[PDB]
Structures are given as structure tokens and as C-alpha cells.
Amino acid sequence: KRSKENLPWVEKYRPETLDEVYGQNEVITTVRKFVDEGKLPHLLFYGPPGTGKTSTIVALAREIYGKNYSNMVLELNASDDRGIDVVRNQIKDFASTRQIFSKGFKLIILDEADAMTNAAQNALRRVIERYTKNTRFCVLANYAHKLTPALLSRCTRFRFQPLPQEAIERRIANVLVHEKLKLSPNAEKALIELSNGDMRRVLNVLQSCKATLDNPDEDEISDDVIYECCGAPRPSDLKAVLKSILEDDWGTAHYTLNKVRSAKGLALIDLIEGIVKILEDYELQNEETRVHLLTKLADIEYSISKGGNDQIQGSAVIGAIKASFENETV
Amino acid sequence: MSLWVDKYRPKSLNALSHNEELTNFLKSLSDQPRDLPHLLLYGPNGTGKKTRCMALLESIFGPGVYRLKIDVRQFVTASNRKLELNVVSSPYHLEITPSDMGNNDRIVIQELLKEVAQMEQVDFQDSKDGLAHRYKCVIINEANSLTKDAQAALRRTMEKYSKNIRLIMVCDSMSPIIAPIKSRCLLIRCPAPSDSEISTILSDVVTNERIQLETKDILKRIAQASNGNLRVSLLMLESMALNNELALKSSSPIIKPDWIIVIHKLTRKIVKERSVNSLIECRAVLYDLLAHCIPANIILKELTFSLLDVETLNTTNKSSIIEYSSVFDERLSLGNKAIFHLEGFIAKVMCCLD
Amino acid sequence: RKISKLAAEQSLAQQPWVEKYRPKNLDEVTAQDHAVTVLKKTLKSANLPHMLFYGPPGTGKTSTILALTKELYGPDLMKSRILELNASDERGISIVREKVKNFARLTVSKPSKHDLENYPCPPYKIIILDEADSMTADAQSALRRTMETYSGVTRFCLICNYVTRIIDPLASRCSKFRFKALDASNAIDRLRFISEQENVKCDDGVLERILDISAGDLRRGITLLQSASKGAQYLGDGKNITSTQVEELAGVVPHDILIEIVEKVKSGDFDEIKKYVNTFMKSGWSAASVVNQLHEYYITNDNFDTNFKNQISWLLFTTDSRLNNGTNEHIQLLNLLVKISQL
Amino acid sequence: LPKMRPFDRVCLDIQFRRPDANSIKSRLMTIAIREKFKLDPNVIDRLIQTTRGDIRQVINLLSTISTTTKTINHENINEISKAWEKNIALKPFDIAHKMLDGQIYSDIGSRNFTLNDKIALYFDDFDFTPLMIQENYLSTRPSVLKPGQSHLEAVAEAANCISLGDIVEKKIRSSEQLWSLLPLHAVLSSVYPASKVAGHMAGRINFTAWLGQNSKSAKYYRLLQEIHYHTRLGTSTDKIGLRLDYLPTFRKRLLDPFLKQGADAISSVIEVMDDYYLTKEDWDSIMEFFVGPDVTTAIIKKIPATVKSGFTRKYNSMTHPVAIYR
Amino acid sequence: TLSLQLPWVEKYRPQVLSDIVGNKETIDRLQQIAKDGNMPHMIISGMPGIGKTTSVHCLAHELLGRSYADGVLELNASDDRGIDVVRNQIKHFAQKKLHLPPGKHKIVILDEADSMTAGAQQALRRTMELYSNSTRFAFACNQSNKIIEPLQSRCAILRYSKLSDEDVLKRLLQIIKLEDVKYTNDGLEAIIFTAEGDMRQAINNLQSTVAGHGLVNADNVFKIVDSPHPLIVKKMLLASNLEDSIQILRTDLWKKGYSSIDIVTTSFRVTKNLAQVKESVRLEMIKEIGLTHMRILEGVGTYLQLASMLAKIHKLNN
DNA sequence: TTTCGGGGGGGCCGGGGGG
DNA sequence: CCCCCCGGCCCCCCCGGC
DNA sequence: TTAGGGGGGGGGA
DNA sequence: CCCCCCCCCCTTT
Ligand SMILES: Nc1ncnc2c1ncn2[C@@H]1O[C@H](COP(=O)(O)OP(=O)(O)OP(O)(O)=S)[C@@H](O)[C@H]1O
Ligand SMILES: Nc1ncnc2c1ncn2[C@@H]1O[C@H](COP(=O)(O)OP(=O)(O)OP(O)(O)=S)[C@@H](O)[C@H]1O
Ligand SMILES: Nc1ncnc2c1ncn2[C@@H]1O[C@H](COP(=O)(O)OP(=O)(O)OP(O)(O)=S)[C@@H](O)[C@H]1O
Ligand SMILES: Nc1nc2c(ncn2[C@@H]2O[C@H](COP(=O)(O)OP(=O)(O)O)[C@@H](O)[C@H]2O)c(=O)[nH]1
Ligand SMILES: [Mg+2]
Ligand SMILES: [Mg+2]
Ligand SMILES: [Mg+2]
């Protein structure tokens, strides 16, 4: 811990204020309005990984309390003990006692509350209800089915969406300004495509790309750099493989698949996912074709998840695609 | 006294009597044993895998490997249960069957094996090279019965402590062994002996035991009935000799085990009757077989191949039977209660035949 | 009695070739440059991220992390700066919440003057969770905030063969490094270096055949090379190692036996197929190898039409998937051959 | 209950049964006249049915209802009964009887007893319900057979679903502790096969025989392991190979001689035992394993008592080795 | 800002039995009991946010009055309620001497009693029986089955039904008049629709909508309250064309950030409750959904698996 | 039956304090 | 110097879905 | 619609 | 009085 420059980019660029959280404008505006007029309710931030839930709640705590928010809030996460005993003693004591430093209300942040036991969640009900005059609760989750209905009944729900293109673009621009980096438009589009709405993936991939450049001060991050660092197929490779599968005979398709994979050592699963993405846009005359494609490719992906013979799996992909598309004629 | 299958078991590589190429390969392995990798011997059951493992150990260390002592090691689960494991040991090697504790086999790998792995050799076990041995050999019998967790635990133990121990695993099939473990081992195929080699071994046993034989065709018949299982062939020869007052005639019938006869009777019942009541009686038979330590996989294989040998069935019936056997063997691999899957297989076969 | 302790070099000299030739520095990793370059840049950038190495067996993940720790810290400071936990350790949720967290929150060990003068010595320690895919989901969830909160003094490296076993939050937190399968093209240089170092004489193409048989696993290839070298040394003839010897040592079915199987399948008689398979299983051939060879034969054969190949590909995939579950080889192989014979 | 096992045959057991409506009608009418509220006798039988013979609950119901409704008659009996119905979890026999009734699987029956109700019925005892269903799903006369479908085919479908349920059960009790799969298990182990073979029970409902068979198998495996590790020093095999291959020959060299040479064979048998470190208990256990035509119980009982007495005497009159020194 | 506005679920929490809406007959029974006293042991059961705790507290207050502080012992899941507590604290409270009017008793309120252990429940039996002359017990729970049968025998059963849209609208209108909230009929309809009979949820959503947007109309309500995903899942499963179901899955669930595990669990529940489909078809659908659920739990949670599940469901339905 | 993990309840053990 | 109170491990039994 | 079989107890030719 | 009606309760780790 010698300097912030020694941190991974996923942590070096953690938002410190609500103005640095992108892609969640509705939620940020609503919560800021709540805080401004002193109408903060019990909150439930629900969303997928790397969308800004923990960042948003920490920034909200800083806004409410300032720089010394750490001693003014009670933060518990999945790495801490949160059994029913903790609810009965520590949370209850914090919720029923005044602040040491100021006279303001009290904030309890139950990060990753979907990992809490059912007994603790049930015990939380009357703690939340009884001390609502002076205490507020925030619950963060990725899986809503692990939350008891009683807890959900007491909370106001905010859903964090997968990050849109514009927010990722703006954060990438800020990171490029800070790091003195150059990025090509095609490389940026590929980075957004592989992000899948998760900012952590964007930051990690960008850090790897910078590490890849021979002279990062002068070399620009091209799509080739991204595909090399991530070891992912190019769109042209996927197009060629799909065209060979759908047009050529078995020998040619097998040869083309093996050659494309061997050129850069691509993984079969990445090719399967890319081809599935491409095929979703294809207009099919028969529903049976789509049914066969989906079922067979899902089976192949499940088989790959456990290992198995790579060559047989590739041949299975080829055969499944051909057999499914033979249903488009009659 | 000691059964003929045990009394005449070879105790050295030069005493092996079949698969000369495998013997030469083992001798080549034992020529420079200092850098011996971990070994995994796979092949049909009852062919001589353990005999060859012991012979290789004898060639490496010497006859002292055959001075075996039995000890008991104690283990404690997370629930405070007390488990006992029998360990066969010699001055030079250890032998374990962790599957003895079922799902607790992992503990054996995580506590006992590691403990052995973290010990350096200080006893002056002078070798043929003139220097003392630096590693002890650990044999893992029925290595394919280990749970995936125990196999995972074996992984880094095999690599980190290679200087202190060398593992020799023996299995009848490599299908249940995880890929990393197979990658970490030198794989040795152990083919079954040919019929002529079995006949030669049985003739040597006969001459050393002074048994009257009307001809040499009885030994060939026993060899064919054994299906390449040498241990079964020797035990069957002894059984026939006992049943015929140490005098075998050309008409001496081949003896079959109790469970085989029961399974054949079950196959006949399934073929002749296809009804729910027949299925209930089949369930009773299956319970009887399982209760007396007949493994479910063995029952499934025997029943499938007995059904496939029925002369009244047609090609479609046999194809359906083999398909159902494949499906329900997979079910057995991934299931807990074997009787459920065996009953399902029998019901499907009854439906297909009827 | 007692034995005088052996030297490290002498001990390593008499180790199995896979351990003997394990890479000692990042420059010795063969064909993983797309990740090794990124890791090497950290020796100067000193901003190592959380790492998730994933790949098939014997591709160099554990070797890579060990070499990285060596290069970063030095033989004196590595032990104090590294905490290693693998599948042979206890890694329950309680262990994650107490031992891992306690090590993560500690102040970094003090480097010595020599360590600072001779190594980068970044201001953080490393927790390696090898075989992380064996850890339960709840234990993994217990690591989420520990990774982020103490990232200033601790960095995590998770290593696995099946990346799907890692929960999505952890995969999100970690920078992903996929280790590519090692085949002839990208591993022949290292295999040839090892063979030359050990003075192994082989016919042209033998090393390429070994790497083809290994099917992406360099550990298996090195073990096969060592076994072939032992055979040649024992024979004491001086003749070069041949591809036939390698195939016999690798458990590959001879081509004549495969052709016999193909003819039996072409015949289509159930009883004959059953009898031949019963005789065949006595040889002890691995069912997976037989299925792989059958796939190679049928898929690349110009005498079969598109429909036949479409069906046989699915049949082979189903049989391979079933075999991966630890099923009886005899039943699965007989079923596969019978089904092919009816195509 | 299992906890009551220690009280098996130590105390005089006195059973108190649910009292019928007739034994109490006078009590409730007296309470009604004393408490000044009107109660129709014709509904008493219903009221008890609501309380399942719980007199205390009946009195509580009367006290609570009379607070606002001073007259209890047929005009309000149905609502009171439905509101105060005692919903007690069924026992395994009742669960099996209900789940295998065909009526609930018809359109009207399924609309009255919904799939959710069937899953809850499973959850009344999730440990025993699947065992009950697997035990009793072949003992029915179905009324839900699809056209052209024989009883055997439906039984086969149910058996396949039961196998899938067993796989799910193995998943639940693994190291991942996937208890969230319990509802799915309920469908695969109980509801689906029952719907396939639902009808009328052909005979008596039987308790699952799997637990006793499992215990017997565990006992036999323990005995087999003990025998194997007694004979380990001499043999070359695993315990399964010992059971499948060695045991018949040991039968021929240990049991047959007594049936041929009488007492003159005793020595030989003991010799064989000494060669394999086998004890008398190992001898009996070995004789207990054989099945089918090679059952030994009748043969052993047929042996003259003098021969067995001499065998025991001779074995006890000598010194024997020990395979495992503890 | 370091100030908090008191939630309306607490500010307008009913203080008397006449302010509680729904379950009219039971409320009148409670009012009569409070009038004439002689409160018996009771168990109140029902779904969340319908006024069980409110009912019990109002009954206790109206019965005791000035003696409330001394004659009421309240224990819930946030307090220690072990067998030791039952054997010492509750027993001491039951044995304690307290002069009360001629028709009043001490009250023990065990809120969320379904979480109590079987040992404590067993210990409560003879304590209830022996001290009934001075003490009475009120249990409140969501699942009455968790209460052991011996305890149910000694108590009066009160099963609370769900609130109808009319009662919810009445209470919301009362609160709106008290707060001078500006609204539109569509806004209240949306609030009631999203509440699903939960008064607490309805009031919380109303207050949040007022705070965040001022005007309670349809748009603001749906911006604050999201359409329940079970309905989206039902629409996905009931679609006739596989393309329509896939489009719903991709656009309304996957792109909105809903996790695959949540989607599959909700699909299982909705399929179980789909009374409009034949039970056998529902069983096949559940088999396929369970296959997908097991795959997801294994770690393969992807859009492709869910799409394959939908394809298999459509294949079954055709 | 039972492969983690949480929760509860009861039994000893031992530190500290008091006499 | 010896006895008693009361905090803390330690062991053992029981759910685990809605 | 009542799974088979045993126990309890009110009614009665 | 034995027989019958009628119901309940046990089979069960
Ligand atoms: N909306 C965002 N704006 C800017 N950076 C973000 C945003 N979301 C995620 N990040 C980046 O990714 C890192 C992690 O963000 P988090 O707030 O922790 O996401 P999260 O939703 O809490 O992840 P989970 O639910 O614990 S897996 C931040 O430090 C940021 O660097
Ligand atoms: N990229 C590589 N470069 C050089 N040698 C390698 C390489 N990969 C594997 N090996 C060799 O095979 C041996 C094992 O390498 P490992 O690093 O252990 O592979 P691994 O990916 O960690 O295997 P798993 O995932 O535990 S099965 C090394 O000691 C090397 O001798
Ligand atoms: N019938 C009702 N009439 C008026 N307000 C109600 C009613 N029910 C619930 N509320 C309101 O919602 C708030 C909570 O009601 P509660 O009585 O706590 O519901 P509950 O059934 O006890 O919740 P659970 O079972 O503990 S999750 C009350 O303070 C009221 O403001
Ligand atoms: N004469 C002779 N007998 C052998 C040989 N190999 C195996 N056997 C016999 O076959 C028996 C079974 O061998 P074993 O190693 O236990 O079978 P496996 O371990 O299951 O493969 C042994 O008891 C030996 O008596 C051999 O090479 N020569
Ligand atoms: Mg977070
Ligand atoms: Mg490794
Ligand atoms: Mg409440």
C-alpha cells in the first residue's frame, strides 16, 4: 500500500461521489432527491455483478455523513459473521444507540445480504420496524430469491441495469485521459461488446491491453491487441467458420474449424457463443430449426463445462448446426 | 491349505509367465528407478496387475517388499466420528484402499498420505546403485473408486512431494479417474493373458499338485470359461479338482458362482414373464443380491450380457436392451440408491420385449 | 540410521522429467505469451491485478504463478509474501472468513536490503488458491469483499480447469487469463529442448507425434518422452525411437485392430459385433482412446455422406459424455458400435 | 417415535383414543345451556370433525365463536369448520394412500387438490415420502392409464422418473448442500410417478423395505471387510474379488469336508484357517454370504452336533496366529 | 442531510381496533373480546403486511390501558426466546402478582412465533395451562403449521385473509387525505396492483412515489415500483411462438439484469401455479425447468441454457 | 442412511474473586 | 490458602422448501 | 373410493 | 349372550 497507482484499475477507479457513478441516472437522481429532502427510506439495491451497487451505497454514505462516514455507519458483508446472534446483539445495539460523533441518523449497510441465513433475516424484521425512527437499512443483492418476503416487504427496491453503451464510453474516455492512452474506435466497440455491461471486465481488459503495448505512450490499442490479450475470436473468424459449416462439405468444414482454432489457439466455447450470437439474428422459416439449434448447442456447452474430448465436441457442433439447418428446406 | 491361486503366485519379474512385452517394459522401468514417475496400471480384472506391481517393487527394493504387516490408523471427521483404516506396510512401501471409508476417503488423502508425503527418507536403504533409496512407494488399490474430492486432493500432493514418495495406482478402468490425475501418471496397459498362456499356467499347477487329467482339453475349457480372468481360472480349477476327487474327466462340468446362477435365473424369468408381478419378484431377487455384497454395477453388466446371449431375442430387442443398459449404467454412476436404477432398467427391458 | 541430506540440484536431477524441467522463470513458459507478457510488465508497473488463470490440464498455470512469485520477490522473501491453499487443504467458509482474511489483512513482510536491491519487491502479498473450482459457492462468496477491501496489501490468484465453477462475482473481480492447449506447433520447441538436454535420439516426426497424442497436455508428452527414453536405454541398441514405440507406450490402438472394428461395424451383425467387442476388451484398451480414433477415422473419411457424419458426430458426442461420467467401458462401447452399425 | 424406543416393554401401555361425538354431546349441550348460547346437536359431529376429536379445541372454538355469534346452526357450520379446521401433517401410510389415489389426478380432482397441495403433501415428510412411493407404486390398479397404454408401460415411466429423483437426491445431499432442489425432488420422486400409476391400492400399503436392506448390506460389508483384512496377507485381490471368486473355493475347502469326512476333516479345515488367519467367527460369516443354490443354513443345521462340538473343541484346544496385531 | 421523515407505515399505524381494515369478522370478534375481556389464548396467522402485529398490539392496549407497561410481555425473533427464557422469564412473568380490573389478564405476545424452537414450544404447554387464571398468550405467525399441535389445541385459531383492493384503496385514500397527496386514479390502481394485498408495501410505495416525484400517477408509480417479474415469466411461458417467448426472455428479463437463478426459480413457481394448463403438461414443464435449474446451479448460468429450456417447453406444448 | 453449515442446549473446565 | 461464581470452549442433536 | 387387519364399545335377537 | 355395526387406529427406521 505505497500509492493508489499500485492498485488494480478496478479499485483505482472506484467512484468516490455520486457524480462518478455512470449508467444508473434514474437511481442516482431518486436517491439524491431522497437525501436532499431528508426522506431516505430503507433501500434494496438489486442487480448483476459490477453495476455500481456497493460504489453507490458508499458514495451515498459519504454524501450523508462526509469524510468520516466510516465511523458513522455499520457495514456488514459476506466475509463477516452475520448469524442470528450478530443481529440480536451488534445490529440491535447499533440501531438503538445515538451516534458518537454527531446527532444524525444511523445507517446499516448489509452488503451481499443474499448470503445471510433465514434465521438472521427473520430476526431483522422487528429490528428494522422498531428503530425506524432513527435508523435506516440498506440491503444489496444479486439474487432476489435468497431474500425472505418479509424483508422485501419492508424495503424500497431499486434495480441496477446492465451498464449502457454511453456510460461505458464515458468512463473509458476518463480512464484514457488519466492513463494517457490511445484507443481505436473498433477496439472500443470490441471492448464494449465483450464487457456485457460489467465495468470490472472493461477495466481489467483495458489494464491488460496497456500492459500489452510495447510503448503505451505512443502505441494505440487496436482491436488486434484486445483479441490477443483476451484470446478471443475475431468476428471474421466466426463468420468464416459459420459459412464453412453452412455451405461446404464435412471435410472442408472440419478443416476450416481446425485451422481457424489453431491459428491463434481459440477455445471452442468462445466460438460456440459467437456463433449463437450470430444465429440469433438469422431469420428462420421453421421453428424446428431454432429448437434443434438451441437444445443441441446447450447440451454441447454443458458437456464442455465438464471437460471432455475437444475434437468430438467440435464435430458435434458442426453436425448439430448442419442437421438443424436441414430443417429449413422442408 | 493355501489355495493354488495363492501358493504359486510369482514373486519376481523373471517369474512372470505371460505378456512378455509388458515384462520387458517393467524391467526397463526398473533399470533406473531413481527418477521413476508415478504409475497407473489399468486393465481387466484378475489379470495380474497387483502381481506385477509387487514384482516391480521387488526388483526396485528387493524381496523385503513381501514382508507385509497390518496396522490400524485412526481418523476423526468434522462431526467427531471415529474412523479406522487398515494399512498394509513393508519396510519399503505402504498400501491403502481409501475407498474403505467411502466419502471420507478424502480425509485419508488429506491427512495420512500428505503426512507420509512430507517425510524424507533417512534410513540407509542401500540400493543397487550404491546409494540409499530416497523415496517410499505408496500403492492405492481400487484407485477408480475414489471420490472426485480425494482425487483432487491427490493432485498437488503428487507434484510437491515427488522427491519423498512415488504413487502406484491400480484400477480396472480409467473412466472414473479425473483428467488431471491421469495427466500426472504414467499409464500402463495390462492385457489379459491368452488362452494358451492360461492353459500353460494351469498345466503347471496340475503337475505340481499331482492332479489326474483325462486330457488337456479340460484346461482349455476352463480358460475359455474364465474369459481371460486368470484368478477365476485357477480358483475354478481348484474347485473342479476338489469336486472330482483330484481327478478331472472330459465330462467334468464347469462350475459357476452362486451370484452368476442367480442372475441367469433372473434373466430367464425376465425373458419368460413380462408383468408387474414379475417385476416385484425381480425386485426381491435384486434385494437378495445386493444384500450379500454383490455390487450393483456387476449385477447390471452380468444381467445385460446374459440377456444379450438369449437365443430367442431378435436384433431390435438386443439393441434396445444395450441402449437401456448404457442409460442406466450412467444413472448408477450418478445415483445413490442402486435398486431404483436396476428396477428401472428391468422395467424398460420388460416393456421392450413385450 | 541417518542419511546425509541431498543438494537441491542433485535432488532435482533424479526427479521425474515433468518436475525436473518445470519452468523456473517466466521466460521458460513456452506458449502463453499473451498472458506472460502482461504478467512480466508488472515487474515494473507494480500494479498486479487479481488473477483468474483457467485452462486444460498441463498447460502451465501453477508453473506460471510460481515463476511469477519467484521473479517478484526472490527466494528469500517469497515464503513470507505467499500463502498457498489447494484442494489438499481445508477451505470451508469458516477457513475463508478467518485464516484467509487474517492473512489478507496483515502488514506485508519487511524486505531486506539485498531483496530491495535485487528484486522489485512490490508492496503487497499474494494468496494463491489453486484448484479453486473445488471450493463451494458459499466459501467463494465469503471472498468477495475480502478481495476488494484489502487489495492495497493483498492480491489473489485463482487457478482452475473449469471456469464455470467460479461464481460470477469472483470472475468479475478477477482479470481472466486463459491458458491455451499445448500442441505440436507451439510446444515442439520446448519438447525438443528437453529431448536434446536428455540426449534422446528419435526419428523425425516422433516429437510431433508425441505432441499430437498428448492432445494439448505437455505434462503427458514429457512423461511419454521419458518412458520412451527409458525403453531405448534399457534396450541398449542405439536405434532411434520410432513412432510405433510411442504409440504402443501411449495406449493407441493399432490401425489393423481399428480396421477390424470398422469392418465388423460395416457388417451390421449384432452377434458378431458383440463377440468381437468381448474379445477386444480383453486387451485393456481405453474406451476414450478407441472413441477418439473412431471419430478421427469416420469424420475424415471421404466415403461417407453428410447425413451419416451428422448422425455419427452426435453418437460419438453422447458416448464421450457418458464415458466422462465414469461408466462401464464395455457397455458404452458396445452400444456405440451397435448404433453406428445401424446408420 | 424413535425416542420412545427405550420404553418398549417396561411399562403398561394405555392408549387413549379420540372420543366420538356421542360420548361428549351431553357435555357440549350442558356448556351451551350454562353459557346461554344456542347450539344445534346435528352439527356436533361436524364440530368434532373440525377438531379431530380434540375436546379442548372444541371448547375453545365454542368460547371464541359465541362471543359474536350466539346461535350455532347449519346456516354457519361450514364457514366455522373451514376456518377452524385442524391441519395436521399426515403420516407416511396416509401420505402414500393419498398420493396414489387416482381421483386427485383427474381434471376436477386436480382442480380441487392442486399440484401445490401435492407438493405440500410430499413436504409433510420429505424423508419418507419418496421411499413410500417407491415401495408402493407397483401395488396399484391404475385409473389414469392413457389409451393404448398398459400398466407395465406406466410402471416403467414411473421407475425412470424415480431414478431421476434419486439422482437429484444425491445432488441435494452433496458437499454443495443444494437444499433449494427439494421441491424438484418432490416432483420427480413422488408426484410424477404417482400421477403415472395413480388408482386404487390393490393390496395393503407396505412400509419401505429399503432401510432394513441397507442396514443388512452395511452389516455384510463390514463382515466382508473384516474377513478380507484377516486374509489380506495371503490373498491377492480386493474385497469384491474375495466375495465373487475366493469365497466359493473357501466353501469347498471349509464346509464340504465336514459333510463328507465328518470329524476326520476337522484338522484340515483348521489348517486352512491357520493358513489364512481365519477364526471361527470368520468361518460362520463366510458361511453366511452365499446365496441361491449354495445357501448353507440348512446344510449347517443338518450337520451332526457331535462334529460341530468337536470342531469347536479342537479350535479352542490350539494356538492360532494373528493377521492384525492391535 | 441528517434528518429523517417518519415512515407513513409507522405514523399511520392503526392505534385502535376500528382503524384496521380487512378480515371484518375477526376484527369485530377482537373488539367484542376487548369490550368484555376474558381474552383466551390465540394464534393469529396470515401473509405478510396484513395487520397481525397491529391487531395484537391494539387488542393489548385497549384491554389493559394504564396497566399496559406492567401487564404485557412482548417477545419476537429479535429477542432471546430459548428454552431457558421460557422456563425463567416467561414463568416469572406468569407467576407475578398484579392487581387488574375484574375482567382483565396479563398478556404474553410472542410475535413471529413460527421461528420458536420445538423445545420452547413444549415448555410453554404447562406454563399456559397452570397460570391461565392470570395470564393469556397471543401468538402471531405466518405459517401456523410450525406451531406444534399441543399449542394449537390450547389456543383460538384466527386465520387472516388477504386484503381486497377495496380495503387497500380505502386506507390509501384516508392516508392521502391526511397528507394532502396529489394523485390520479391510474396511480392508485397501479399502486394497488403492485402491492398484491400487502398494505405495508402499498403505503411504502405511495410514500416513495410522493417523495421522489410528487404526483402519484401511473408513470411515477411504475418508475418507483417495477412490474413484478413473476407476471413477465408467466407471459414468457404462456407465449404461443418460440420467437415471442425468446424475445420476452431477452428484452424483459435478461437485459434488465435479472439473474438466471431468479428466472428459473420464478419459472418453476409460476408453472406450479399455472392452473390454466393441464397438470400433466405442467409436470413435464417442471421436469425441463428442473433440468435447467440443476445445470445453472452447477455453474453454467447463461442465456443459451434458458433459451434451450424455453425451446423444450414449446416442443412439449406442441 | 447421509456427504456443509447454522443454531440451540447442556456438560465440563478453569480464571478470577471473595472469604 | 481454599471455595464459589460465571464467563468460555467443547460436545451432541436437529433442520435444511414455501 | 374406502389398503388389510386388529381393537373398543354401544346395541340387541 | 355371541354377533353385528361403526369407527378408530396400527402397519412403520
Ligand atoms: N456505475 C459504475 N460507474 C463507474 N464504475 C463502476 C460502476 N460500476 C462498477 N464500476 C466499477 O467496477 C468496480 C466495482 O463496482 P461495484 O460497485 O463494486 O459493483 P457491484 O454491483 O457492487 O458488484 P457485486 O454486486 O458485489 S458482484 C468500481 O470500483 C468501479 O471501478
Ligand atoms: N507452458 C508450459 N511450459 C513449459 N512446461 C510446461 C508448460 N505447461 C506444462 N508444462 C510442463 O508440465 C508440467 C506441469 O505444468 P503445470 O504448470 O503444473 O500445468 P497445470 O496447468 O498447472 O496442470 P493442472 O491444471 O494442475 S492439471 C511443468 O512442470 C512443466 O514441466
Ligand atoms: N389492516 C391494516 N390496516 C391498516 N394498516 C395496515 C393494515 N395492515 C398493515 N397495515 C399497515 O402496514 C403496517 C404494518 O402492518 P403489520 O401489522 O406489521 O403487518 P404484519 O402482518 O404483522 O407483517 P409480518 O407478518 O410481521 S411480515 C401497519 O403499521 C400499518 O401501517
Ligand atoms: N504362473 C503365473 N500366475 C499369474 C501371473 N500373473 C497373475 N497370475 C495369477 O493370477 C492371480 C491374480 O493376479 P492379480 O494380480 O491379483 O489380478 P489383478 O490385480 O486384479 O489384475 C494371481 O493370484 C496369480 O496367481 C503370471 O505371470 N504367472
Ligand atoms: Mg458489490
Ligand atoms: Mg496446476
Ligand atoms: Mg408482524
Side-chain angles (χ1 to χ4, degrees), chain C residues 203-218:
Chain C
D203 296 334
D204 291 8
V206 170
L207 299 183
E208 298 59 32
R209 181 78 190 120
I210 287 167
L211 288 175
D212 295 329
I213 290 163
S214 305
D217 192 336
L218 181 49

Side-chain angles (χ1 to χ4, degrees), chain B residues 199 202-203 206 213 216-223 237:
Chain B
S199 294
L202 297 171
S203 62
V206 159
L213 254 68
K216 295 297 191 184
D217 287 3
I218 316 114
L219 302 182
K220 146 172 316 193
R221 270 161 47 231
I222 295 164
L237 177 79

Side-chain angles (χ1 to χ4, degrees), chain A residues 185-202:
Chain A
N186 288 258
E188 157 101 353
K189 277 185 65 265
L191 187 51
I192 276 77
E193 157 276 322
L194 64 87
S195 74
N196 277 131
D198 187 340
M199 189 75 82
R200 277 189 197 120
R201 190 45 78 241
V202 182

Side-chain angles (χ1 to χ4, degrees), chain A residues 112-255:
Chain A
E112 304 154 346
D114 39 14
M116 289 189 56
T117 60
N118 283 313
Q121 289 187 52
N122 283 325
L124 282 171
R125 291 155 64 178
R126 295 297 293 158
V127 181
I128 297 156
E129 276 196 289
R130 161 106 85 88
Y131 299 108
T132 185
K133 174 120 191 312
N134 297 301
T135 302
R136 286 285 182 283
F137 282 80
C138 187
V139 168
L140 297 76
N142 305 105
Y143 318 117
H145 79 278
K146 309 286 325 312
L147 304 182
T148 62
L151 187 60
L152 300 156
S153 180
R154 288 155 170 76
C155 285
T156 302
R157 178 177 175 274
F158 293 83
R159 210 191 79 261
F160 281 65
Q161 78 198 312
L163 287 161
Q165 200 176 109
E166 319 74 275
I168 303 199
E169 274 167 14
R170 291 184 272 141
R171 198 36 158 161
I172 285 167
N174 294 283
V175 171
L176 292 164
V177 168
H178 172 301
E179 299 285 343
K180 301 169 230 282
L181 255 170
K182 263 178 293 312
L183 182 63
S184 77
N186 288 258
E188 157 101 353
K189 277 185 65 265
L191 187 51
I192 276 77
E193 157 276 322
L194 64 87
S195 74
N196 277 131
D198 187 340
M199 189 75 82
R200 277 189 197 120
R201 190 45 78 241
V202 182
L203 292 166
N204 282 322
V205 166
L206 201 58
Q207 189 178 345
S208 277
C209 287
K210 194 187 187 186
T212 296
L213 304 180
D214 284 4
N215 189 178
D217 304 10
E218 311 184 5
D219 314 343
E220 151 161 326
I221 291 169
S222 52
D223 49 24
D224 296 12
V225 176
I226 295 180
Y227 298 128
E228 207 279 346
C229 73
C230 304
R234 312 192 64 99
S236 44
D237 299 319
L238 297 160
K239 287 326 172 107
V241 162
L242 188 46
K243 176 183 190 83
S244 187
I245 288 154
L246 295 166
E247 295 196 342
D248 318 342
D249 77 309
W250 258 91
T252 299
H254 180 78
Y255 171 90

Side-chain angles (χ1 to χ4, degrees), chain A residues 42 148-157, chain E residues 9 48-50 163 168 172 191-209 224-225:
Chain A
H42 307 278
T148 62
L151 187 60
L152 300 156
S153 180
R154 288 155 170 76
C155 285
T156 302
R157 178 177 175 274
Chain E
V9 297
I50 67 186
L163 304 173
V168 173
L172 289 181
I191 289 267
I192 293 147
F193 176 84
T194 51
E196 307 200 77
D198 185 344
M199 198 69 242
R200 191 202 277 106
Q201 201 84 267
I203 288 156
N204 281 325
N205 289 339
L206 178 73
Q207 186 172 37
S208 275
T209 304
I224 281 279
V225 200

Side-chain angles (χ1 to χ4, degrees), chain B residues 155-156 159 179-181 183-184, chain C residues 16-23 28-32 36 54-66 130-131 133 159-161 179-180 182 186-187 190 194 216-222:
Chain B
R155 289 167 59 163
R156 283 294 296 156
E159 299 179 300
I181 293 300
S183 180
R184 281 168 168 76
Chain C
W17 286 11
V18 300
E19 306 303 349
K20 179 169 177 174
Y21 288 97
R22 179 183 293 284
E28 284 197 306
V29 184
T30 299
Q32 312 293 13
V36 170
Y54 70 103
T59 44
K61 303 178 293 292
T62 295
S63 301
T64 292
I65 185 55
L66 293 168
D130 210 340
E131 290 126 23
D133 44 356
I159 305 173
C160 60
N161 292 308
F179 276 65
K180 298 166 182 177
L182 303 173
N186 62 12
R190 180 64 175 179
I194 288 163
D217 192 336
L218 181 49
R219 195 200 272 110
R220 186 145 100 90
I222 291 160

